[PDB]
Design a binder for this molecule. Sequence first.
Ligand code: PB
Ligand code: PB
Lengths: 280, 363
Amino acid sequence: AEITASLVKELRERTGAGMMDCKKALTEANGDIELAIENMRKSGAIKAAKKAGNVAADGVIKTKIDGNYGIILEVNCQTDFVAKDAGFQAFADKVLDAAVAGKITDVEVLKAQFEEERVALVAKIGENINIRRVAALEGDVLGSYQHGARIGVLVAAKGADEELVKHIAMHVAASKPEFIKPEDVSAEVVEKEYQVQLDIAMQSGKPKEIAEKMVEGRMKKFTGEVSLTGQPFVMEPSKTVGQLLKEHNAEVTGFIRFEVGEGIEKVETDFAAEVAAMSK
Amino acid sequence: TKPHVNVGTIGHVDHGKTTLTAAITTVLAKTYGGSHVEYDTPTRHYAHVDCPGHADYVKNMITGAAQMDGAILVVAATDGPMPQTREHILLGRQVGVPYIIVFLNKCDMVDDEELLELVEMEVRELLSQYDFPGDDTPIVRGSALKALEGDAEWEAKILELAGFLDSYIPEPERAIDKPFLLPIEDVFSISGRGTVVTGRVERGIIKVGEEVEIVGIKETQKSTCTGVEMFRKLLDEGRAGENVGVLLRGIKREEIERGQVLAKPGTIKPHTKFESEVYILSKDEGGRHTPFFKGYRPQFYFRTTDVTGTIELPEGVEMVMPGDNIKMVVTLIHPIAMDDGLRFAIREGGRTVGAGVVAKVLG
Ligand SMILES: [Pb+2]
Ligand SMILES: [Pb+2]
């Protein structure tokens, strides 16, 4: 069949693939839409490969709870314009739903399941997209909190109603504890942190006997600051989260906080410089 | 002095924004002789930024970057609009960029006129879906890289784009041409019982004999300028950017206060409620260390004074962390003179902890 603009339009409206990609695929396919779609599918793996080394530090955290089971998920892209795109969002939601349904905590299993969809998505969006990590939290009561798309939290609790769990999730999102209780910090870590603070205290000229007692104080502060129950409750900082829990006769048995692009170094851009480099 | 126009590029990461901007600077320098880039047409000086991030742009507009007078949407014709082109245009609507020009890139790689037309129609339709005038939008069919390589055909399309920057974006209005406004800083009385108010003329011109309104905080009053003073020296008018004293007919010292404005009658109104775009400083920028919540009750600093306000957060938003930018609706405890686009600081205990822009006056 003849490769008219209207036939290209039909394929493009169906797929969202780039205009010239559609023209090329249809032409080789002799105008057969379905074969053209298969042609673009094979081509898309190579287009995606070309993008796969691009840093993708934007995107979304998503969370979903199913009774005693909850998933937290990071899916990355390059720009926040794409993070907001409906197609990207529907992809991330679809991955989220599958991880909950299948109770999938191995991110490589999730990757394999969605690699063809991911590639077709990258082939039409033109950014690297990556299913980066997934985790499950199990619990008696589960809750979540989304700080827009950039921070997601799951919390497992005992004896807490909806509102309490959500406020604790909000607290975790803001204050990023890495332990539940101060006594959860391992003896090894506390001893090392002690040596760190004592060295620092000594080189500032504090006599040993003074420095030791001050460092004992610093260790309490240290385990308090890195633990959920030792932290001042963000909504009422005159009390710790531990005190808040006690007042409601509740406990926290778990949490997970993901933040988009954690552990990916921020690339700085210099537009003016890049424009001047181009001129040559 | 040469009109100044703030423009920006927006579009997919590799559809050609940077290359285009380099082409604009190269071809204009070739044709007329000699972070952001700058370039000149014979009639206009341009400052040009890139808009790679939505939140980043919005935060820059809030913290002081000049608002775009017009944006250049860069789309490679080889692809046509991407799924996220919707989002590029939507940012444009959100910040109210007054004009969008389109540069279709890599047109040399689309040999088929009907396919270029398909792309063009898609872009017009997307623009009109966000109330830009799609049908009247200048669309240039160019090729940035080939222009940069000195191909005369494609250089001419760069000059076409620059002409549209010249023709399609109106010369921005200068402060001196706007209705007179002076933010009032101090208030004195002289001996002939003539009240004097001081400040830097923000815009326009105040001449002896002209009526003014005193607007904001209290019921609006009306007076007549009986004199303009510049460091004890008697002047016949005060102009935008000048530090002056304005002497007033009849109105008494106790009736005017700092934070009000002097204005050309009927040109600015007092308001209590508005929609705003706000940026809350991070800890490292000298701002709050901790989040606030729906009962946050800070001061909003407009021009020369603080006004306490309460806030409403967007649906679904329960918490604001240092470093966030969000929309909020503010209700001041008393009115202040304001228009869409008015910048303000957010303060607590007299310390600035955020910045914002009035996006829409409500009441
Ligand atoms: Pb170890
Ligand atoms: Pb040592």
